[PDB]
Design an enzyme around this catalytic site. Sequence first.
Site, PDB file in Angstrom:
ATOM      1  N   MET A   1       0.809  -1.217   0.000  1.00  0.00           N
ATOM      2  CA  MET A   1       0.000   0.000   0.000  1.00  0.00           C
ATOM      3  C   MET A   1       0.852   1.281   0.000  1.00  0.00           C
ATOM      4  O   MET A   1       0.426   2.300  -0.546  1.00  0.00           O
ATOM      5  CB  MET A   1      -0.976  -0.033   1.182  1.00  0.00           C
TER       6      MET A   1
ATOM      7  N   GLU B   1       5.066   2.996   1.753  1.00  0.00           N
ATOM      8  CA  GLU B   1       6.111   3.033   2.779  1.00  0.00           C
ATOM      9  C   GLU B   1       6.551   4.469   3.085  1.00  0.00           C
ATOM     10  O   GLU B   1       6.437   5.337   2.215  1.00  0.00           O
ATOM     11  CB  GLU B   1       7.310   2.117   2.415  1.00  0.00           C
TER      12      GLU B   1
ATOM     13  N   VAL C   1       6.829  -0.671   5.802  1.00  0.00           N
ATOM     14  CA  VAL C   1       5.941  -0.852   4.653  1.00  0.00           C
ATOM     15  C   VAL C   1       4.548  -1.240   5.170  1.00  0.00           C
ATOM     16  O   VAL C   1       4.433  -2.079   6.064  1.00  0.00           O
ATOM     17  CB  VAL C   1       6.511  -1.893   3.643  1.00  0.00           C
ATOM     18  N   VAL C   2       3.502  -0.602   4.620  1.00  0.00           N
ATOM     19  CA  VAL C   2       2.104  -0.852   4.971  1.00  0.00           C
ATOM     20  C   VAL C   2       1.507  -1.771   3.899  1.00  0.00           C
ATOM     21  O   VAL C   2       1.625  -1.491   2.705  1.00  0.00           O
ATOM     22  CB  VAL C   2       1.287   0.455   5.169  1.00  0.00           C
TER      23      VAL C   2
ATOM     24  N   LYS D   1       1.405  -2.871   9.111  1.00  0.00           N
ATOM     25  CA  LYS D   1       2.655  -2.135   8.978  1.00  0.00           C
ATOM     26  C   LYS D   1       3.801  -3.041   9.427  1.00  0.00           C
ATOM     27  O   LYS D   1       3.862  -3.406  10.603  1.00  0.00           O
ATOM     28  CB  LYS D   1       2.616  -0.843   9.810  1.00  0.00           C
TER      29      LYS D   1
ATOM     30  N   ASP E   1       5.865  14.122  14.642  1.00  0.00           N
ATOM     31  CA  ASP E   1       5.888  13.853  13.196  1.00  0.00           C
ATOM     32  C   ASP E   1       4.534  14.137  12.491  1.00  0.00           C
ATOM     33  O   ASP E   1       4.020  13.290  11.746  1.00  0.00           O
ATOM     34  CB  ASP E   1       6.440  12.432  12.904  1.00  0.00           C
TER      35      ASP E   1
ATOM     36  N   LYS F   1       2.383  15.380   9.748  1.00  0.00           N
ATOM     37  CA  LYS F   1       2.533  15.546   8.300  1.00  0.00           C
ATOM     38  C   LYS F   1       1.351  14.907   7.607  1.00  0.00           C
ATOM     39  O   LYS F   1       0.753  14.013   8.190  1.00  0.00           O
ATOM     40  CB  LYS F   1       3.866  14.981   7.775  1.00  0.00           C
TER      41      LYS F   1
ATOM     42  N   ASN G   1       0.840  11.235   7.516  1.00  0.00           N
ATOM     43  CA  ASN G   1       0.420  10.666   8.810  1.00  0.00           C
ATOM     44  C   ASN G   1      -1.029  11.044   9.190  1.00  0.00           C
ATOM     45  O   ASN G   1      -1.438  10.797  10.320  1.00  0.00           O
ATOM     46  CB  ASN G   1       1.406  11.059   9.934  1.00  0.00           C
TER      47      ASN G   1
END
Length: 287
Positions: free
Chosen positions: A29, A31, A36-37, A50, A143, A145, A148
């Site tokens: 999906m 990273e 990596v998701v 994840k 974090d 953003k 996120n």
Amino acid sequence: RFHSFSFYELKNVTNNFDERPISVGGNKMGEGGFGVVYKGYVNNTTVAVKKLATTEELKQQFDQEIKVMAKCQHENLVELLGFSSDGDDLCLVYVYMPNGSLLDRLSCLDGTPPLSWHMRCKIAQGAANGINFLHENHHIHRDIKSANILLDEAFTAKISDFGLARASETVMTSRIVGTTAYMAPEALRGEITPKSDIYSFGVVLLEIITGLPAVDEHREPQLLLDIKEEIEDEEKTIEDYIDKKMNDADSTSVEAMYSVASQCLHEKKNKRPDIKKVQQLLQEMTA
Ligand SMILES: CC(C)N1CCC(c2cc(NC(=O)c3cnn4cccnc34)n(-c3ccc(C4CC4)cc3F)n2)CC1
């Protein structure tokens, strides 16, 4: 709390951690959050797995995420369902977010339709309610953003990635972490303060208004936050920056959102508004 999944159950649901994209028929999906998701179907539900992805530091990023999630449960925060530590990799299991991240939706990744200004207002409001919740619970995200800020089946803003989160409940650190293009000047210097999360949310609001990434090497300015200065030192205006991929954005509400972003992006941490003020200003914008 959460479920304790076996690494082998998560291998089966993710089709043995397929690095192939969803479009081709794979499970990867994206990273960018220290791993990596992947997509999966666990306990009759679609899930996001994840796979994390110093080794000591990364294990602490894993332990903090679960720690924050256990205490913190809100409608504007992503829902962690379980985890995996038994196998060769550290895995985090979440409720699947059908509309991925705000970053991907602002760039219309994979041909998704542009977000309307109406949706954009709801996202800005919801994300501030999620930050407020964390700040009320003496947590600093570290974090904030658009990558996120995740979106659900109703385009509800869901803050994710609490691996770098810190409890309070002004401190300093030798290990400076976060995303450069979103970071407050003091945060880049080692300072840990909730005021830095406010600054980062100000960059996010500029991404909402403009549809532009916080950083682009092939762009003038390269950093989105420099536009605040271009507008102030009247070379350009906010209207020259409004995302053209919208048909419902009125100047009044767009200027109202920029006012909030401008206030958030003050270089003096003590001069920035707190989350409750940000939330209040965003509510007044709609309504
Ligand atoms: C309509 C189509 C085109 N969509 C379907 C949804 C799809 C999608 C779904 C997800 N991710 C999730 O569903 C997700 C749920 N909780 N969670 C917590 C942390 C990170 N990701 C997640 N991502 C996703 C994957 C990776 C990341 C990391 C920042 C890179 C963020 C994400 F939102 N991308 C994207 C394509």
